[PDB]
């Protein structure tokens, strides 16, 4: 006694040992405080949001490199947590959050070493960097949470760009990959990473009634592959039979995890 834990999977009472136990059901992202982990096979804990008992880490590894739990610690933040929405209809959710709540959501501009085209303007389209070599060194100095190459030019989203929005009290809506989650954590700027999970190929067409089936299958395959690799990085997983419900859940998740005190992974 005793540490704090975070569920990386959905667990139901009845599927394991019926409701006829003192067991505790929990969903992905639930933070549990363990009281007794002495039992080799099963663990005593309580929900931090409601007192009972939860299965162990080595135990669930036996049933199904499997994902069980991650140890977490409470931390106080003084900035607004950045946002990383992933999965189907993420672009619509990103654009909708910014238009609907302009006082609490903002966006940042990526850097590039590509010569600024005449119609483009610096600071809005891109932060245009005249010296390529300078950006490559900033990349090596861990100044970028994401960086790539296109037509022999560097593109990237800097940690400073994100932090500037965050320190003005606004959630930075980020168009980045899941790999940016770890780098933001390492920069002590922990994002709310939300994964929109399609229940099936048919569900994709339900939450996105615009795209074709051919596009839906590709989006579904990308979503399944995304969940395979970055599930640990997800702050939450949301589902729905419509985009409006998904959007509804995204708003709730953001509100719940935007508190002064948050839970972050431990050693």
């Amino acid at each position: 006694r005793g540490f704090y834990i975070r569920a990386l999977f959905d667990y139901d009472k009845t599927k394991d040992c019926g409701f006829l136990s003192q067991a505790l059901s929990f969903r992905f992202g639930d933070v549990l405080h363990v009281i007794d982990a002495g039992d080799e096979e099963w663990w005593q804990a309580r929900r931090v949001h409601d007192i009972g008992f939860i299965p162990s880490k080595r135990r669930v590894e036996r049933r199904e490199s499997v994902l069980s739990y991650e140890t977490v610690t409470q931390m106080e933040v003084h900035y607004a947590r950045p946002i990383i929405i992933l999965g189907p209809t993420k672009d619509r959710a990103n654009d909708d959050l910014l238009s609907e709540f302009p006082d609490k959501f903002g966006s940042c501009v990526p850097h590039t070493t590509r010569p600024k085209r005449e119609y483009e303007i610096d600071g809005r389209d891109y932060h245009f960097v005249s010296s390529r070599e300078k950006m490559e060194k900033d990349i090596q100095a861990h100044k970028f949470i994401e960086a790539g190459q296109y037509n022999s030019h560097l593109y990237g989203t800097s940690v400073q760009s994100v932090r500037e929005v965050a320190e003005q009290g606004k959630h930075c809506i980020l168009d980045v990959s899941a790999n940016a989650v770890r780098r933001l954590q390492a920069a002590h700027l922990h994002p709310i990473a939300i994964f929109i999970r399609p229940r099936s190929l048919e569900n994709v067409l339900e939450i996105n009634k615009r795209i074709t089936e051919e596009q839906a299958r590709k989006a579904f395959d990308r979503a399944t592959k995304l969940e395979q690799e970055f599930t640990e990085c997800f702050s939450a997983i949301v589902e729905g039979d419509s985009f409006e419900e998904i959007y509804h859940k995204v708003k709730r998740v953001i509100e719940d995890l935007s508190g002064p005190y948050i839970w972050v992974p431990a050693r």
């Binding site: 654009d95 966006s107 590039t112 891109y126 190459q149 296109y150 560097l154 593109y155 989203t157 168009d175």
Partner: peptide, 16 residues
């Protein structure tokens, strides 16, 4: 409105 496809092709293409 926050999306730059040049940036996207840079990232989802080959990245650092």
């Amino acid at each position: 409105r926050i999306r730059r496809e040049e940036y996207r092709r840079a990232i989802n293409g080959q990245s650092f």
